[PDB]
Amino acid sequence: RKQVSDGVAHIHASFNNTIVTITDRQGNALGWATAGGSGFRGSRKSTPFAAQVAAERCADAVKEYGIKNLEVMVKGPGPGRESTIRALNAAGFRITNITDVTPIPHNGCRPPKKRRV
Amino acid sequence: IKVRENEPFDVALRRFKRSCEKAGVLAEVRRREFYEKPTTERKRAKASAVK
Amino acid sequence: PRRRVIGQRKILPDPKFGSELLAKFVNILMVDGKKSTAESIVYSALETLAQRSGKSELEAFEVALENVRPTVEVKSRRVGGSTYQVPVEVRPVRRNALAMRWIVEAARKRGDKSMALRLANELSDAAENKGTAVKKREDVHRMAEANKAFA
RNA sequence: GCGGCCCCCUGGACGAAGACUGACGCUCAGGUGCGAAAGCGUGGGGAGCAAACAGGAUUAGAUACCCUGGUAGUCCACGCCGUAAACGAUGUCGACUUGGAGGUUGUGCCCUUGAGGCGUGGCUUCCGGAGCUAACGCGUUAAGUCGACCGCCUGGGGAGUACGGCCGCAAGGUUAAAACUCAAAUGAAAUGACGGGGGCCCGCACAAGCGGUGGAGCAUGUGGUUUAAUUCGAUGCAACGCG
């Protein structure tokens, strides 16, 4: 219902996990998934396998609105950012550009410092 | 701090970034200011080679 | 194993065919230094494969070698604790030798009464990629297609 | 000790050549002043933070860090507190004595005309002579050659401990002993196994295959047994067809 065929994709990257989400231009999301939902419990979540499999799982879940192009909203410096883009460029979507929107806070608050290592 | 590379590597190979980490400056700035310590780059490695 | 060199060594062929390929087949089919019986079973297998195939014996041999031919493999290094292997195109001489030894082991996987009969039947049904070693080739191929994720 | 940007009050330093007063200086025992962060008192404020505590894993053994939460306190306005590795481990003020490549600051007459010639100054870097230095090293900003002062030292523990007098609201801070005990406590120096903390080459040891047997049947000798004893010894790559 109400096929869009255009939108932007938000990508999250973290040391402990990674998730992929998809929305439209104005910003009402349509897809949601966790790489841990595809299994791989433990440190293997950081491996590209879970990220990529969650990528095609979300892509299959979102075919129903019929999209053809998307945009890369990547977040976080975590390992990855490579499985998702090159799994979605051939999943039935064509990329448009790339961005860097990972925050760089201007020395606002004290970071968690109790951590030795 | 950023990665935008391709499929093949997927594991480690960022030990060059470990060398470029410069653990001194990060371990110095994460915990308090010193104003006399980051000098370790000079004046104590070349100037203290005592035999 | 680190300073030595490779001289491309070559040993006694069979004078009837006079081919280095058939030379290496017969010389690896050797066991414990056995010449008469080993070559006798080799010729028995060759004549039987020609009889069953019906086509020319040498071209059927080449077709069988092409059927058993694998493409790629990797080497275990144990670098990071997980499977971290760079897929290297194996040496053509080493690839040929590995194909030879896979054929020989496929022949060896039985325990039949008569060595000549067993050898003839298995190589003959392996000549058309439907025998014994082609399963090993497929398994080796399955070992590939997934080691390129890490390079 | 000082870091967004705007405005107002305000402190020192230095340069250019000009006039001007005419030893008006230096150093400072008691004494006033300033003095990071933790603390205490009045209130105000509370985003994240995290002493004490709350729960899980943790091993020979955690009231240790690792993780999840979580008050004082870090913030503001007034007052108290006078200590630190408050170290350049080098008290202040003057006059002299061989050298080098810089950072930076304003004027000289040119020749910015290019980023070159006067440092004629100030503050700072890093190497390195004569000379000192027990040695490491200091080395025109001296640990050199001299002068004026001050403050401080006489072996380590007992100890910046105890009484006593001051300072404070408390926690406490300054001034400073003895009895007894020891043959020492201590600096610099590569002088070596130590390279378990880092670099570099070497070996069927590793990157491949064939056999063996801890899988069955038989001798072997000890550490050894069932008997009359079951000789001297073979108990780490130095136990086996060995003496």
UniProtKB/Swiss-Prot annotation, chain A:
Question: Quaternary arrangement and interactors, per the entry?
Answer: Part of the 30S ribosomal subunit. Interacts with proteins uS7 and bS18. Cross-links to IF-3. In stalled ribosomes contacts ribosome rescue factor SmrB.
Q: Output the PANTHER family linked to this UniProt entry.
A: 40S RIBOSOMAL PROTEIN S14/30S RIBOSOMAL PROTEIN S11 (PTHR11759)
Q: Other comments? A: Has been predicted to contact the N-terminal domain of IF-3 based on footprint studies; exactly how IF-3 interacts with the 30S subunit is controversial.
- Give the classification, highest ranks: Bacteria, Pseudomonadati, Pseudomonadota, Gammaproteobacteria, Enterobacterales
Q: Which InterPro entries match?
A: Ribosomal_uS11 (IPR001971), Ribosomal_uS11_bac-type (IPR019981), Ribosomal_uS11_CS (IPR018102), Ribosomal_uS11_sf (IPR036967)
* Role summary: Located on the platform of the 30S subunit, it bridges several disparate RNA helices of the 16S rRNA. Forms part of the Shine-Dalgarno cleft in the 70S ribosome.
Q: Which family does it belong to?
A: Belongs to the universal ribosomal protein uS11 family.
Q: Which UniProt keywords apply?
A: Methylation, Ribonucleoprotein, Ribosomal protein, RNA-binding, rRNA-binding
List the molecular function annotations (GO) for this entry: small ribosomal subunit rRNA binding; structural constituent of ribosome
Q: Spell out the protein name for this chain.
A: Small ribosomal subunit protein uS11
Q: Which PROSITE patterns match?
A: RIBOSOMAL_S11
Q: Which SUPFAM superfamilies match?
A: Translational machinery components
Q: What GO biological process terms does the UniProt entry carry, in alphabetical order?
A: cytoplasmic translation; translation
Q: Name one GO cellular component term.
A: cytosolic small ribosomal subunit
A Pfam family matched in the record: Ribosomal_S11
Q: Can you name the source organism? A: Escherichia coli (strain K12)
Swiss-Prot record, chain B:
| GO MF entry, a single one | rRNA binding
One Gene Ontology cellular component annotation held by this UniProt entry: cytoplasm
Q: Does the keyword RNA-binding apply?
A: yes
Q: Which domain of life is it from?
A: Bacteria
Which of UniProt's keywords are assigned here?
Ribonucleoprotein, Ribosomal protein, RNA-binding, rRNA-binding
What are the GO BP annotations of this UniProt entry?
Answer: cytoplasmic translation; ribosomal small subunit assembly
Subunit field text: Part of the 30S ribosomal subunit. In stalled ribosomes contacts ribosome rescue factor SmrB.
Write the protein's name. Small ribosomal subunit protein bS21
Organismal lineage: Bacteria, Pseudomonadati, Pseudomonadota, Gammaproteobacteria, Enterobacterales
Q: State the gene name recorded for this protein.
A: rpsU
From Swiss-Prot, chain C:
Query: Has keyword Ribosomal protein?
Result: yes
Enumerate the GO terms in the molecular function aspect. mRNA binding; rRNA binding; structural constituent of ribosome; tRNA binding
Any one GO CC term of the record: membrane
Q: Quick one: a GO biological-process term for this protein?
A: cytoplasmic translation
Could you list this entry's UniProt keywords, alphabetically sorted: Ribonucleoprotein, Ribosomal protein, RNA-binding, rRNA-binding, tRNA-binding
- Additional comment: The strain K12 sequence is shown. Has been predicted to contact the N-terminal domain of IF-3 based on footprint studies; exactly how IF-3 interacts with the 30S subunit is controversial.
In the record, the note on similarity to other proteins reads:
Belongs to the universal ribosomal protein uS7 family.
Q: What job does this protein perform?
A: One of the primary rRNA binding proteins, it binds directly to 16S rRNA where it nucleates assembly of the head domain of the 30S subunit. Is located at the subunit interface close to the decoding center, where it has been shown to contact mRNA. Has been shown to contact tRNA in both the P and E sites; it probably blocks exit of the E site tRNA. Protein S7 is also a translational repressor protein; it regulates the expression of the str operon members to different degrees by binding to its mRNA.
Report quaternary structure and partners. Part of the 30S ribosomal subunit. Contacts proteins S9 and S11. Cross-links to IF3 and the P and E site tRNAs.
**The name this protein goes by in its record:** Small ribosomal subunit protein uS7
The lineage, from the top, is: Bacteria, Pseudomonadati, Pseudomonadota, Gammaproteobacteria, Enterobacterales
What gene does the UniProt entry assign to this protein? rpsG
Q: Which residues of the full protein are shown?
A: 2 to 152 of 179
